[PDB]
Design a protein around this ligand. Structure first.
Ligand SMILES: *[C@@H]1O[C@H](CO)[C@@H](O[C@@H]2O[C@H](CO)[C@@H](O[C@H]3O[C@H](CO)[C@@H](O)[C@H](O)[C@@H]3O)[C@H](O)[C@H]2NC(C)=O)[C@H](O)[C@H]1NC(C)=O
Ligand SMILES: *[C@@H]1O[C@H](CO)[C@@H](O[C@H]2O[C@H](CO)[C@@H](O)[C@H](O)[C@H]2NC(C)=O)[C@H](O)[C@H]1NC(C)=O
Ligand SMILES: *[C@@H]1O[C@H](CO)[C@@H](O[C@H]2O[C@H](CO)[C@@H](O)[C@H](O)[C@H]2NC(C)=O)[C@H](O)[C@H]1NC(C)=O
Ligand SMILES: *[C@@H]1O[C@H](CO)[C@@H](O[C@H]2O[C@H](CO)[C@@H](O)[C@H](O)[C@H]2NC(C)=O)[C@H](O)[C@H]1NC(C)=O
Ligand SMILES: *[C@H]1O[C@H](CO)[C@@H](O[C@@H]2O[C@H](CO)[C@@H](O)[C@H](O)[C@H]2NC(C)=O)[C@H](O)[C@H]1NC(C)=O
Ligand SMILES: *[C@@H]1O[C@H](CO)[C@@H](O)[C@H](O)[C@H]1NC(C)=O
Ligand SMILES: *[C@@H]1O[C@H](CO)[C@@H](O)[C@H](O)[C@H]1NC(C)=O
Ligand SMILES: *[C@@H]1O[C@H](CO)[C@@H](O)[C@H](O)[C@H]1NC(C)=O
Lengths: 591, 185, 12
């Protein structure tokens, strides 16, 4: 006794599977011992473990491997294994862990898997398994981990999976299940730490029973059609760190009992129909991330949230949130992302948002925020996205704020901001989109704007900016939109406009620009929309304009003179040249 | 939102060597902040500006979801395959510029459903078959270029085509009509 | 592609 043909059995496996990359080259038939072979693990020389992960192995599950008597750990993760899982898999009665993730296995789950008493870990993720989960699964003896994620199972959610006492993790996410309620019997899963039921077509109320799982760490019931009030019993999850209820039809008020969760860090109940005030007790908990966005919540954000030293994510946008943001917000926390957009938030912004220095996203658009940008934000080189638009903000922009290097979008649109753009704009390397429209800003555009070659969009509409366009502005080849309308800009366009090869839109309307249109306008390959209306542009229209294919052209109310070229005669250019006195052309009404 | 998801679908099926569609983050609430995408005051897409972007690959029917789109500019690229039918569901479209590409197959009949279309530039493509008579029923049509194509059959001379010149239907395989030198048989 | 159990990332 105590001798085996384990190497032979492995050679049978090798012959059964296609190995184009010859990953199983180490497996030498002629060798006495197989325990030095690639991915083969012997705890005497009996095989206890085989791992053939990412081996480009193709073929059916090799049921002959079960004749390996002491095999405890089998992984065939990330392979091209195909066909139905053989019911003769039960023969592997010594297996504790089985990983068959990222394989092309298909058909109904083998009920015989439950017949393996020793199984502790089962992962069948990224497989085409279909049909109802076998009722035998309820009788798993020592299974702690069940993963059927990203499979094609079209069955209801099994109440019998509640009878597996030893289970720590129930992972059935991203399966096209028959619309089914969460079993209350799942509450009797005493040792469960993870309930991952995202995109499982879950319907109906969340059971009060789910509260009795005190070992629960992660509760993900997101991306489902679950309705009803969030259960107050949920505060019974002593060890809960993460609750995800996002993208559900749940109605009601966020329970105050959630404050009783000492270990809670991440809560997401976003994209729900929840109503009422955000609880003070929840905000008292030192939350890592609080997302309650796209809800019908009302009232003031409790100031207790500022005390948390673990806060990097606050996304509460799309609510009717009144009052002002807490003064100490961002001072005691590593703030990275803030989204208070589409709320009724009012008052000066908390000054110490970037105190920790990891703040990348500041989004406060469509609120009633008033006052001046805090000077601290000038020190915030961490910022990449800033959206302060549609608030009541006034005063000059801090010099440093213009020059933050990794900002790619700066949006101050629809505020009452005043002052002149600093020469510090040259330091904004990552800036691609600059939107300063509908503000009270004044001055001449800095020459340092030409430094920003990577800049793609400039919109400064409804501003009091004045003077000649910097010659540097013509150096911005990558610019696709230039909107300078409703400004006091003066001067003549140069031949350098030729460098605007990638420009899609030029709007210089309602300005004091003077002089002849440069004949290089035609050289702009992708110019489709041109508005030079309400200016003092004079002289003959360039013949190069005809070469351009323009969807929008307005040269109306200028000093342009000479005959309209033959192409321009069309009624499609009817309202394009009104108000230029020296323009005499074929259209009905002109001259 | 739905409009951003439809545009991201296009990103997946297009080849973008220069990463011109990098701004197209599907996790953004709406696609308006994206470069090459323009929106109205109600945050609905009105323009897609992707001319001369070295894009290849194929279009998707999900472009049809963009009901308030006015300008579809995919010109001077190497995009291949057919123009989808769902492009007719673009009720507010004013410009369809697909010229200087390698599009193939028929000009969809659905393009006649574009009641407010003003510019149709499909020139310098490998489009094949007859010019739909539905196009004539577009009252707003002011510009049409179907030149440097391999289309065939009757060239409509009625409705919006009444004003159109030979340069619009030039260098085609076998177009017969009054505008053409050879008559229709 | 296989996702993870964590907070949603929808942002303006
Ligand atoms: C964002 O800022 C825009 C400009 O500050 C602002 O726009 C404007 O809309 C109002 C109506 O809400 C228009 O109203 C009035 O002015 C016209 C003449 O221009 C009159 O005929 C009307 O009777 C009325 O008095 C403004 O003209 C218009 N201005 C501009 C420059 O567009 C937006 O409403 C702001 N949006 C938000 C959400 O704050
Ligand atoms: C699954 O296994 C394959 C190899 O069998 C892994 O693939 C390849 O992809 C790697 C990263 O994408 C490259 O670095 C390798 O050079 C490439 N090799 C071959 C032979 O194609 C693949 O990434 C694995 N997937 C996972 C999730 O681990
Ligand atoms: C499972 O995968 C294997 C390997 O890709 C498939 O096939 C084999 O069939 C080929 C012909 O299609 C032969 O040329 C191969 O030599 C042969 N290899 C082996 C190891 O049998 C098999 O048909 C696949 N089955 C399914 C249902 O997809
Ligand atoms: C079951 O689901 C959980 C989801 O919570 C998976 O993962 C987690 O495991 C990861 C493994 O590296 C950790 O890095 C994560 O931090 C952890 N997340 C939580 C919230 O606990 C787990 O891998 C899944 N198991 C299987 C076999 O698929
Ligand atoms: C040219 O196109 C028009 C497009 O309307 C054709 O139109 C007739 O239009 C009426 C609507 O007033 C439709 O009910 C008919 O079905 C159309 N006729 C046919 C035969 O389908 C018109 O016939 C076309 N004519 C030519 C010469 O091409
Ligand atoms: C419940 O689990 C136990 C132990 O795992 C098992 O013996 C019993 O048969 C199971 N019952 C059902 C209905 O699955
Ligand atoms: C610019 O910002 C974008 C988006 O925030 C980011 O992905 C990119 O890596 C940044 N680049 C640099 C050079 O900072
Ligand atoms: C040009 O602008 C004027 C107002 O300044 C407008 O009334 C006219 O309709 C515009 N024409 C075109 C073609 O946009």
């Amino acid at each position: 006794s105590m001798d085996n043909q384990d190497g032979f059995i492995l050679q049978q496996v090798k012959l059964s599977l296609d190995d184009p990359d010859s990953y199983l080259s180490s497996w030498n038939s002629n060798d006495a011992s197989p325990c030095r072979w690639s991915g083969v693990s012997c705890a005497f020389s009996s095989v206890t473990s085989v791992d053939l992960s990412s081996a480009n192995l193709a073929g059916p599950f090799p049921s002959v491997i079960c004749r390996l008597s002491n095999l405890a750990h089998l992984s065939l993760y990330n392979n091209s294994i195909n066909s139905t899982l053989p019911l003769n898999i039960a023969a592997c009665k010594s297996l504790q862990t089985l990983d068959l993730s990222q394989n092309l296995l298909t058909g109904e789950l083998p009920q015989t898997l439950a017949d393996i008493p020793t199984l502790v870990h089962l992962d069948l993720t990224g497989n085409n398994f279909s049909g109802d989960i076998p009722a035998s699964f309820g009788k798993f003896e020592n299974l702690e981990v069940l993963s059927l994620v990203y499979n094609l199972l079209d069955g209801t959610i099994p109440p019998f999976l509640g009878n597996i006492s030893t289970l720590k993790m129930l992972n059935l996410s991203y399966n096209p299940f028959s619309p089914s309620r969460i079993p209350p019997e799942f509450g009797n899963l005493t040792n469960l730490e993870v309930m991952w039921l995202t995109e499982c077509h879950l319907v109906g109320q969340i059971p009060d029973s789910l509260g009795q799982l005190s070992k629960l760490v992660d509760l993900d019931l997101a991306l489902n059609d679950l309705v009803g009030h969030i259960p107050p019993s949920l505060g019974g999850l002593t060890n809960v760190v993460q609750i995800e209820l996002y993208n559900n039809s749940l109605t009601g008020e966020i329970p105050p009992e959630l404050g009783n969760l000492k270990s809670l860090r991440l809560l997401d109940a976003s994209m729900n129909q929840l109503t009422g005030k955000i609880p003070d007790e929840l905000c008292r908990v030192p939350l890592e991330s609080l997302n309650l966005y796209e809800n019908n919540l009302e009232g003031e954000l409790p100031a207790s949230i500022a005390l948390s030293p673990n806060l990097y994510e606050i996304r509460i946008f799309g609510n009717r949130l009144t009052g002002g943001l807490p003064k100490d917000l961002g001072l005691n926390s590593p703030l990275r992302w803030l989204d208070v957009s589409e709320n009724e938030f009012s008052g000066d912004l908390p000054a110490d948002l970037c105190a920790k220095g990891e703040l990348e996203e500041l989004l406060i658009i469509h609120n009633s925020f008033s006052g001046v940008i805090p000077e601290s934000l000038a020190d915030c080189r961490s910022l990449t996205r800033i959206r302060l638009a549609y608030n009541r903000f006034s005063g000059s922009v801090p010099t440093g704020f213009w020059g933050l290097p990794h900002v790619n979008l700066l949006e101050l649109v629809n505020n009452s901001f005043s002052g002149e753009i600093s020469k510090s704009i040259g330091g904004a390397s990552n800036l691609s989109l600059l939107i300063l429209s509908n503000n009270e800003f004044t001055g001449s555009l800095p020459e340092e704007i030409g430094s920003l070659d990577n800049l793609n969009q400039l919109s400064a509409s409804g501003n009091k900016f004045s003077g000649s366009l910097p010659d540097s502005l013509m150096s911005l080849g990558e610019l696709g939109t230039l909107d300078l309308h409703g400004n006091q800009f003066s001067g003549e366009l140069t031949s350098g406009i030729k460098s605007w090869k990638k420009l899609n839109e030029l709007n210089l309307a309602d300005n004091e620009f003077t002089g002849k249109i440069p004949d290089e306008i035609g050289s702009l390959s992708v110019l489709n929309y041109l508005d030079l209306s309400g200016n003092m542009f004079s002289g003959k229209i360039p013949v190069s304009l005809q070469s351009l294919k323009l969807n929008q052209l307005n040269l109306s109310y200028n000093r342009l003179s000479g005959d309209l070229p033959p192409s321009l005669a069309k009624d499609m250019y009817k309202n394009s040249f009104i108000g230029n006195p020296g323009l005499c052309g074929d259209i009905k009404g002109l001259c | 939102n739905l409009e951003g998801d439809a545009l991201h679908t296009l990103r997946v099926t297009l080849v973008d060597p220069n990463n011109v569609l990098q701004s197209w983050d599907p996790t953004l609430v709406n696609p308006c902040t994206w470069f090459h995408v323009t929106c109205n005051n109600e945050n609905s897409v009105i323009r897609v500006d992707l001319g001369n972007a070295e894009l290849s690959g194929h279009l998707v029917p999900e472009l049809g979801v963009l009901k308030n789109l006015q300008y579809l500019e995919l010109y001077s690229n190497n995009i291949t395959g057919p123009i989808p039918s769902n492009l007719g569901n673009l009720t507010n479209l004013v410009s369809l510029d697909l010229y200087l590409n390698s599009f193939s197959g028929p000009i969809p009949e659905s393009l006649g459903k574009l009641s407010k279309l003003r510019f149709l530039r499909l020139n310098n493509n490998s489009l094949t078959g007859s010019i739909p008579m539905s196009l004539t029923n577009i009252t707003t049509l002011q510009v049409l270029d179907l030149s440097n194509n391999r289309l065939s059959g009757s060239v409509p001379d009625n409705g919006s085509f009444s004003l159109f010149t030979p340069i619009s239907f030039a260098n085609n395989l076998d177009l017969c009509g009054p505008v053409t030198s050879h008559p229709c048989p | 592609p296989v996702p993870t159990s964590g907070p949603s990332r929808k942002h303006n």
